[PDB]
Each structure stands twice: as structure tokens, then as C-alpha cells.
């Protein structure tokens, strides 16, 4: 059974940075990439990041072009994410997902989604 585990709540203050980890199990980690979405309380979902778990290639949106950094570890199959320059509009809920829209090896776009 594909299981994804996320970290706990963060009480970081403005002017600081937030580090969050996602853990995956029950499926081939290398076969698929890792995507991360976000949702503001009372608003719709909002994609923020994608990364291929094979070569370390990463993709960001224009809104978060230079606000976040990411790393991945294949030894434990974990994803660490640093969000910088917090604002009062950053209170939300972030979600981990297995991306099936972009390839892990070459980045070719696939037909699918976060399953």
C-alpha cells in the first residue's frame, strides 16, 4: 500500500525559514517523482513544486521561483524542503504527492496525475 507521511505543524515566525520533510513507502521510489501542492484555508489548491527522484532535476512555478529550495535523499527515500522569506499570507496547508505528469528519468510529460 502506497503510504506518504508528512511532518508536524510548524509555528515559525515571520523572518524565519521552514524545513519540512515528506516520506514515501509501499511503492518504487525511483520509478516516480515527488510533487508538492499547497492550499490556503478557505481557497483552492495551489501547486508549488515538482522534483524528479532520479537525477535531482527540480521544477518550480513563477510565484515560488526564488522562494523555496529542495533536496532529496534516496538512502531513506525522503524529501526535505526549505521555505524562506515568510509572510503573513503563507499560513496554509501543504501536501505531498506522487507525480505522474512529468517523467523521473528524462522529464518527459506523462498522462496521469498525483495518485
Amino acid at each position: 500500500q502506497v503510504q506518504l507521511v508528512q511532518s508536524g505543524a510548524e509555528v515559525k515566525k515571520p523572518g524565519a525559514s521552514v524545513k519540512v520533510s515528506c516520506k514515501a513507502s509501499g511503492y518504487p521510489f525511483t520509478s516516480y517523482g515527488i510533487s508538492w501542492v499547497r492550499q490556503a484555508p478557505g481557497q483552492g489548491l495551489e501547486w508549488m513544486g515538482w522534483i524528479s527522484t532520479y537525477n535531482g532535476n527540480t521544477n518550480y512555478a513563477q510565484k515560488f521561483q526564488g522562494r523555496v529550495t529542495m533536496t532529496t535523499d534516496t538512502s531513506t527515500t525522503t524529501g526535505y524542503m526549505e521555505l524562506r522569506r515568510l509572510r503573513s499570507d503563507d499560513t496554509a496547508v501543504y501536501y505531498c504527492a506522487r507525480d505522474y505528469t512529468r517523467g523521473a528519468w528524462f522529464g518527459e510529460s506523462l498522462i496521469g496525475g498525483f495518485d
Binding site: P28, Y54, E108, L110
Partner: protein
Amino acid sequence: TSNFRVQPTESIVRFPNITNLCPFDEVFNATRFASVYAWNRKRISNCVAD
């Protein structure tokens, strides 16, 4: 007179795992496929051919 010995009952096989599978899904399930004159060529190595 002779020698006595016991014989095996079952048989077991152990192999490491199926990890870092070759990107066959990426090639087969690509959203857009190129034309015949410009066929996309890719090299796959150092993985498990499932």
C-alpha cells in the same frame, strides 16, 4: 556396510529486490509522440529490464 544421508524437502530462491526500474513507462506513456521522420531515440542502461 554403507553410508546414510538425508535429502532436501523444499527449495528456496533469494534475490536482492526490484529497484530503480528502467524508464520504460516514460517511453511508452509519453503524452506526445514524435513523427516518424524525427523518431525520438533514447538510451537506457544501468537498471532492471522488467
